[PDB]
Amino acid sequence: QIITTDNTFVSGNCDVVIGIVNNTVYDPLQPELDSFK
Amino acid sequence: QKLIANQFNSAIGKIQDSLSSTPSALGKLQDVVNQNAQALNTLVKQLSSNFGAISSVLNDILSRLDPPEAEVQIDRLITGRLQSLQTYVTQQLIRAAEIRASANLAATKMSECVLGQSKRVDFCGKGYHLMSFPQSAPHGVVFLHVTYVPAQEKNFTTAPAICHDGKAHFPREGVFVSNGTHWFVTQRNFYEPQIITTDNTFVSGNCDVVIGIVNNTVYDPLQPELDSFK
Amino acid sequence: ILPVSMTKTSVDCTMYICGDSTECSNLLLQYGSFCTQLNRALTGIAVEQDKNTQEVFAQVKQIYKTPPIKDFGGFNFSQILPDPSKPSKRSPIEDLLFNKVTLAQKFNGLTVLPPLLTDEMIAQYTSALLAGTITSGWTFGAGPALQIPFPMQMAYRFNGIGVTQNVLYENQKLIANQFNSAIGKIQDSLSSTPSALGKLQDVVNQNAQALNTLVKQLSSNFGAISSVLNDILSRLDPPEAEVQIDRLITGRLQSLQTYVTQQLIRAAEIRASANLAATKMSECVLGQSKRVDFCGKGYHLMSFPQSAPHGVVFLH
Amino acid sequence: WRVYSTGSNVFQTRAGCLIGAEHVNNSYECDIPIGAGICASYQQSIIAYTMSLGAENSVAYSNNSIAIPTNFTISVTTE
Ligand SMILES: *[C@@H]1O[C@H](CO)[C@@H](O[C@@H]2O[C@H](CO)[C@@H](O)[C@H](O)[C@H]2NC(C)=O)[C@H](O)[C@H]1NC(C)=O
Ligand SMILES: *[C@@H]1O[C@H](CO)[C@@H](O[C@@H]2O[C@H](CO)[C@@H](O)[C@H](O)[C@H]2NC(C)=O)[C@H](O)[C@H]1NC(C)=O
Ligand SMILES: *[C@@H]1O[C@H](CO)[C@@H](O[C@@H]2O[C@H](CO)[C@@H](O)[C@H](O)[C@H]2NC(C)=O)[C@H](O)[C@H]1NC(C)=O
Ligand SMILES: *[C@@H]1O[C@H](CO)[C@@H](O[C@@H]2O[C@H](CO)[C@@H](O)[C@H](O)[C@H]2NC(C)=O)[C@H](O)[C@H]1NC(C)=O
Ligand SMILES: *[C@@H]1O[C@H](CO)[C@@H](O[C@@H]2O[C@H](CO)[C@@H](O)[C@H](O)[C@H]2NC(C)=O)[C@H](O)[C@H]1NC(C)=O
Ligand SMILES: *[C@@H]1O[C@H](CO)[C@@H](O[C@@H]2O[C@H](CO)[C@@H](O)[C@H](O)[C@H]2NC(C)=O)[C@H](O)[C@H]1NC(C)=O
Ligand SMILES: *[C@@H]1O[C@H](CO)[C@@H](O)[C@H](O)[C@H]1NC(C)=O
Numbered sequence: 001q002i003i004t005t006d007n008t009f010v011s012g013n014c015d016v017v018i019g020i021v022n023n024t025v026y027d028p029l030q031p032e033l034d035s036f037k
Numbered sequence: 038q039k040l041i042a043n044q045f046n047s048a049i050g051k052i053q054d055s056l057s058s059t060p061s062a063l064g065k066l067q068d069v070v071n072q073n074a075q076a077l078n079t080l081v082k083q084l085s086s087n088f089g090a091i092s093s094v095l096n097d098i099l100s101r102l103d104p105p106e107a108e109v110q111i112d113r114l115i116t117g118r119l120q121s122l123q124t125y126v127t128q129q130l131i132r133a134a135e136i137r138a139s140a141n142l143a144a145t146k147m148s149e150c151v152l153g154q155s156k157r158v159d160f161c162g163k164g165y166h167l168m169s170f171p172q173s174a175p176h177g178v179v180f181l182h183v184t185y186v187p188a189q190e191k192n193f194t195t196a197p198a199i200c201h202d203g204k205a206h207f208p209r210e211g212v213f214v215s216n217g218t219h220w221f222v223t224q225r226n227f228y229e230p231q232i233i234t235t236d237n238t239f240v241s242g243n244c245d246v247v248i249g250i251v252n253n254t255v256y257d258p259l260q261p262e263l264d265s266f267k
Numbered sequence: 268i269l270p271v272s273m274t275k276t277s278v279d280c281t282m283y284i285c286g287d288s289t290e291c292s293n294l295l296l297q298y299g300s301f302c303t304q305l306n307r308a309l310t311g312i313a314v315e316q317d318k319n320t321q322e323v324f325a326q327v328k329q330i331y332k333t334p335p336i337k338d339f340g341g342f343n344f345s346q347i348l349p350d351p352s353k354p355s356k357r358s359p360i361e362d363l364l365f366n367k368v369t370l371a372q373k374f375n376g377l378t379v380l381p382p383l384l385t386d387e388m389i390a391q392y393t394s395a396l397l398a399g400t401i402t403s404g405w406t407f408g409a410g411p412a413l414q415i416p417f418p419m420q421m422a423y424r425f426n427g428i429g430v431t432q433n434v435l436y437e438n439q440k441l442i443a444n445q446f447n448s449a450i451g452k453i454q455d456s457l458s459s460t461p462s463a464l465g466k467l468q469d470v471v472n473q474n475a476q477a478l479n480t481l482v483k484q485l486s487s488n489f490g491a492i493s494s495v496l497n498d499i500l501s502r503l504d505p506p507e508a509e510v511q512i513d514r515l516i517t518g519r520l521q522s523l524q525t526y527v528t529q530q531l532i533r534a535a536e537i538r539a540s541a542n543l544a545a546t547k548m549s550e551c552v553l554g555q556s557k558r559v560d561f562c563g564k565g566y567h568l569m570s571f572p573q574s575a576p577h578g579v580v581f582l583h
Numbered sequence: 584w585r586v587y588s589t590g591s592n593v594f595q596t597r598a599g600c601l602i603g604a605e606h607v608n609n610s611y612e613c614d615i616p617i618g619a620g621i622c623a624s625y626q627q628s629i630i631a632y633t634m635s636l637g638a639e640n641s642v643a644y645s646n647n648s649i650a651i652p653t654n655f656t657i658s659v660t661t662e
């Protein structure tokens with residue numbers, strides 16, 4: 001399934017963790033709020 | 038991760054010194070060997086006893102008396118030796134039952150601790166249980182329980198619920214704690230404070246139901262995002 | 268209710284069989300090392316009983332004390348905490364248990380050894396375990412004791428059986444009242460029927476019966492002239508007195524051997540029961556168990572151990 | 584054999600008499616089992632005392648006080 005901000009929890013800075021990979025996390029808020037600018 | 042690896046490495050290396058520190062560490066196997074060895078030695082020693090007969094040696098029994106009269110002495114010796122052998126066999130059977138119980142316990146410990154996590158307390162060494170490692174032994178099995186025990190604890194003032202506009206708030210996963218000025222939500226087994234509203238709180242009832250409740254601001258990060266559209 | 272340890276005992280082979288008569292005693296040594304094996308087995312049984320008691324009850328490296336003021340006044344724990352008014356430190360339920368168990372005497376060759384852990388220290392251990400499970404919750408068995416309010420611990424325990432924290436806090440008064448009523452009712456249920464504690468009276472009475480059977484066998488002559496060696500020594504000539512005393516020796520030795528074997532079987536059964544009780548303690552009071560029906564009917568929340576005259580009782 | 588029969592150092596217990604072992608009213612751990620909650624250990628001489636159960640740890644408790652760890656330690660326990 002797609003990586004969304006409602007599926008994963010975020011805590012900490014990127015530097016401390018070893019082995020991370022850069023990627024983009026989808027946000028279900030952005031397209032629902034974009035239709036009601 | 039580096040600290041956990043360092044602790045695990047420094048912990049395993051201490052097992053060798055702990056085991057080799059004293060000869061009493063391996064008592065549970067030395068006792069098992071020694072009881073059987075001494076029982077066998079006692080059974081062997083029981084052979085050279087008169088048991089009320091004229092002599093304990095078969096050859097002397099045959100040589101000293103004629104068969105019609107030596108038959109009684111042979112019967113006495115045979116009955117005594119049979120009693121000794123029977124009592125040794127009974128002792129060995131009881132000890133075998135005890136060892137079978139211990140082996141079943143060891144098999145259960147292997148199948149639970151080694152091959153997966155176990156939520157049974159104290160069944161996996163003191164403290165919370167992580168992966169475990171077995172080791173072979175001469176007449177048994179020796180385990181290594183990698184446990185997780187908390188330390189360096191500090192106390193905070195808590196409360197079961199947080200008031201917010203006449204609406205009780207409860208922790209989704211954790212416990213409300215406060216350092217005296219502000220309130221946070223943290224996992225129950227490790228101090229890690231966070232903001233409250235975003236995901237880790239669920240709403241039920243009003244404030245008048247619960248007994249001891251405290252007021253605090255419940256701030257959803259959703260609203261600042263909405264104000265970005267104003 | 269689970270038995271944990273039978274009464275320790277030990278017999279002197281020469282004193283029991285030979286009556287300390289000289290020549291009859293030196294005649295026994297011809298039979299071999301039968302005397303040493305029985306003494307060693309009885310010593311092993313006694314040390315196993317001691318180990319069972321220590322393993323079941325000494326589950327904590329520290330002793331805890333309940334707070335002087337009961338700030339968890341929702342739930343009422345006066346029926347299981349150590350009552351200070353009585354001269355004994357046993358709790359009211361413990362005191363009811365002690366008075367409900369009744370019948371082990373000295374004899375010619377039989378003795379009884381006191382346990383290492385006296386009853387008062389066993390009660391102290393149980394009080395420490397109860398105070399740990401009341402104040403610090405389930406985490407005092409894993410590491411350092413962590414204080415936590417009792418309603419919050421109950422909220423966690425409810426959260427561990429598939430029901431969220433809403434149920435407890437919104438119904439704290441009802442839960443406290445029901446818990447107090449049940450804790451009051453268990454005492455009446457236990458005191459109502461004397462046969463409730465039968466699992467300990469059984470082992471005590473049956474050990475006493477075995478000991479009496481062992482003692483009663485003296486009177487049996489085993490086909491000899493008389494049951495007293497004095498009559499044989501002072502009446503019959505040595506040539507046949509030797510045969511008669513040897514027959515009596517064989518009979519008494521066989522009786523003692525069968526008693527020793529029966530005690531070994533009983534000790535094995537009691538060791539199994541004590542291991543089960545220790546596992547039950549370590550999985551019930553020192554934490555939460557997901558094992559259904561292993562900790563009583565219904566989903567398990569807590570467990571309060573209490574001492575017994577020769578075992579441990581659990582209040583799931 | 585009877586040289587260890589001096590009555591000046593005889594200590595009476597609940598599980599028989601003791602000869603040559605000093606008796607102290609303090610509290611220590613279980614070193615050598617004796618019986619009826621008495622254990623003997625080594626100080627110069629041998630001391631026999633009454634058994635003790637760890638060290639008292641009165642945990643502070645309140646209806647609004649909780650404690651959570653801020654650090655961990657990993658331990659390996661043999662069996
Ligand atoms: C993931 O993205 C971040 C940010 O774009 C990268 O961090 C920077 O990487 C460049 C090299 O590509 C460095 O010159 C910068 O100094 C980095 N920024 C900081 C603050 O250190 C990061 O390298 C990317 N991850 C990977 C694996 O390339
Ligand atoms: C309790 O925790 C709060 C967390 O916010 C502390 O407040 C912070 O204190 C630091 C100290 O330098 C400031 O830099 C932050 O700006 C403060 N944050 C806020 C939101 O005010 C507070 O000091 C702590 N109090 C105690 C007694 O530990
Ligand atoms: C924890 O217990 C203390 C001790 O009783 C409570 O403090 C009292 O609370 C009552 C009810 O609000 C007041 O009338 C008293 O004046 C308080 N006394 C003191 C000395 O503070 C406290 O309220 C309890 N807290 C909870 C959450 O139950
Ligand atoms: C938490 O907030 C509630 C309301 O948001 C407070 O209840 C108020 O208490 C005062 C007492 O002086 C009353 O005059 C108000 O009418 C109450 N408001 C409501 C909506 O009932 C409550 O006292 C606050 N508690 C704390 C500890 O600050
Ligand atoms: C907790 O339970 C104890 C029971 O031991 C209660 O004490 C009894 O209270 C009743 C109330 O009338 C008295 O008649 C009894 O004499 C008390 N003692 C006993 C041994 O029953 C106690 O009231 C309960 N509540 C609290 C807060 O302790
Ligand atoms: C948590 O505890 C560990 C040790 O159990 C701490 O690591 C120690 O840190 C000090 C100073 O940073 C070093 O001198 C020690 O050598 C470290 N111990 C080990 C075993 O490596 C760690 O700092 C603690 N965490 C916090 C946040 O204080
Ligand atoms: C994995 O191991 C390789 C070694 O071949 C190393 O080059 C790489 O950086 C490692 N990556 C991570 C995430 O550990």
Ligand SMILES: *[C@@H]1O[C@H](CO)[C@@H](O)[C@H](O)[C@H]1NC(C)=O
Pocket residue numbers: 192193643
């Ligand atoms: C935390 O516990 C200690 C005792 O271990 C106590 O002295 C202290 O007051 C407690 N903290 C607070 C905030 O009360």
Ligand SMILES: *[C@@H]1O[C@H](CO)[C@@H](O)[C@H](O)[C@H]1NC(C)=O
Pocket residue numbers: 607608
């Ligand atoms: C130790 O205490 C006992 C009473 O508990 C007392 O009789 C004895 O004199 C004390 N010993 C010393 C050396 O004071």
